[PDB]
Design a protein around this ligand. Structure first.
Ligand code: UKU
Length: 478
């Protein structure tokens, strides 16, 4: 039959506008509402779910014409949820200066510019043919279209409503259509049997916020939820002891971190940031809370970067001697510094924070936990330390070092990181040269500067665990 799925989740996105929903909790919903032109084959080249060969989706075919331009031939008679046919005009709009990457687009998609390629205006050749262009050369256009930046929006409806209102009543081409959105509580979507692709296999999907992981585990056990997300390896034995239930876990291409508001005088310079960084004992946190399943990367450096992955890079440094030394140099009065966390939105956010509070006490710093509820985030002026994550969404080190931490990103712009000039010039350089020894060495230079400056501190890649009924064979949680 087709069941109504009930999914207990760690969090609900602030919006369903597909770019502004980019987070750990938005994509699992917006990937059902919207489609992309092309998709990654997660099992290509023997890959165990992290493959990269690109396959047709809204685009039936595509041809790279030159180093700046890619022609996409679109499927025909694809319907948006309101009965409007998708055409090249919609795809052009999705990647337009008006909506995405122009100067005024930043007021409503604040991060569109930092996460955009160096686009020029798309060209519509006919109803079903669109050419995506870049002002400067880049080989990333095609894989970018398979990413969370590539979800196709309906031009007329979206432009009429505007970005914010569209985010509360989204219309897409995907296999599920919008029914309801209750901020900080739930999203309901229903089967779209007019979908161009395979017929939806669930009648409806409800994403219900269940803040505490033990409540999600109990809800799965009692049948209140069919699927639950964001568990840890410690929950696996209990769940797997029920023959009707199971867990699935794997290392994700995402890192957990803590970061700083660098507009605050206490974090305006590198010494205290680097001190907090060098006192984090990662193997201890991983052994205590992750059953040694979370992995510690050798810097801001991940295997999915391909040609810009360094398999021989050194480990990130643990040095409480230098940390004590840097605390004293900064003239640290001894005042408590807040660390904001939205409960366990990140798996093990609170138990990891309590272990780091003890580690920072052992080097002279007093950090206090400020645990808040969804929607109760502090104003920037009230934020000092906070936890975050970054999903490594491209097969190139451009994401997320340059997206997030580069001169156009939110870490320098919104959160006040005054990066060294060499860092910003290297960011500009790597974004205009092809893969080579020079490009490889330049990213290693950027990684070195990142660790010297500590605008953020990388903890580990979590071992992401979800769980479900065995008789629920399709799980829309990524
Ligand atoms: C316009 C405003 C109403 C806005 O929509 C609303 O979201 C808001 O008020 N945000 P803000 O004032 O910043 O309030 C908090 C303070 C902090 O900036 C917080 N925050 C930012 N990112 C996340 C967030 N990020 P995430 O880790 O789930 O997602 C990251 C993404 O943040 C990241 O872009 C991507 C690629 O690196 O990797 C991950 O998907 N998770 C929980 N809170 C977040 O939101």
């Amino acid at each position: 039959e087709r069941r109504a799925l009930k999914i207990g989740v760690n969090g609900i996105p602030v919006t369903l506008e597909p770019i502004n929903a980019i987070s750990n909790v938005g994509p699992r919903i917006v990937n059902q509402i919207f489609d992309t032109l092309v998709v990654r084959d997660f099992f290509s080249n023997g890959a165990p779910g992290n493959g990269i060969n690109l396959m047709p989706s809204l685009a039936e075919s595509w041809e790279r014409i030159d180093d700046k331009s890619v022609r996409f031939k679109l499927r025909q008679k694809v319907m948006f949820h309101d009965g409007v046919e998708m055409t090249a005009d919609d795809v052009a709009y999705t990647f337009s200066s008006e909506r995405l990457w122009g100067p005024d687009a930043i007021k409503v998609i604040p991060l569109g510019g930092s996460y955009a390629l160096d686009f020029d205006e798309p060209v519509v050749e006919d109803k079903y043919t669109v050419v995506i262009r870049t002002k400067t050369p880049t080989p990333l256009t095609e894989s970018y279209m398979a990413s969370w930046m590539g979800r196709i929006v309906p031009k007329a409806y979206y432009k009429t409503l505007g970005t914010a209102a569209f985010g509360n009543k989204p219309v897409g081409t995907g296999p599920y259509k919008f029914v309801e959105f209750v901020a900080n509580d739930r999203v309901v979507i229903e089967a779209n049997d007019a979908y161009w692709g395979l017929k939806p296999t669930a009648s409806k999907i409800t994403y219900q916020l269940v803040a505490e992981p033990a409540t999600r585990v109990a809800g799965l056990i009692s049948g209140e939820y069919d699927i639950v997300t964001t568990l840890t390896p410690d929950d696996m034995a209990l769940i797997n002891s029920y023959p009707d239930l199971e867990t699935r876990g794997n290392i994700v291409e995402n890192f957990h971190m803590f970061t700083f508001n660098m507009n605050q005088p206490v974090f305006q310079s590198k010494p205290l940031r680097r001190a907090l960084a060098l006192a984090v004992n990662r193997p201890l946190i991983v052994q205590s809370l992750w059953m040694n399943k979370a992995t510690i990367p050798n810097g801001f450096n991940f295997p999915n970067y391909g040609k810009t992955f360094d398999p021989n890079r050194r480990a990130m440094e643990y040095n409480i001697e230098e940390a004590k030394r840097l605390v004293k140099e900064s003239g640290y009065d001894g005042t408590p510094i807040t660390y904001h966390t939205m409960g366990n939105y990140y798996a093990n956010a609170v138990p990891a924070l309590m272990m780091m509070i003890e580690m920072w006490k052992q080097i002279g710093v007093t950090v206090v936990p400020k645990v808040y509820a969804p929607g109760g985030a502090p104003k920037d002026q009230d934020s000092y330390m906070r936890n975050w994550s970054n999903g490594q969404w491209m097969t190139d080190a451009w994401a997320t070092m340059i997206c997030e931490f580069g001169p156009k990103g939110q870490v320098q712009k919104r959160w006040g990181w005054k990066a060294p000039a060499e860092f910003n010039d290297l960011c500009t350089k790597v974004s205009q040269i092809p893969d080579s020894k020079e490009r490889f060495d330049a990213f290693n230079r950027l990684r070195d500067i990142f660790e010297e400056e500590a605008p953020a501190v990388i903890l580990y890649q979590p071992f992401d665990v979800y769980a479900a009924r065995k008789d629920v064979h399709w799980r829309p949680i990524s």
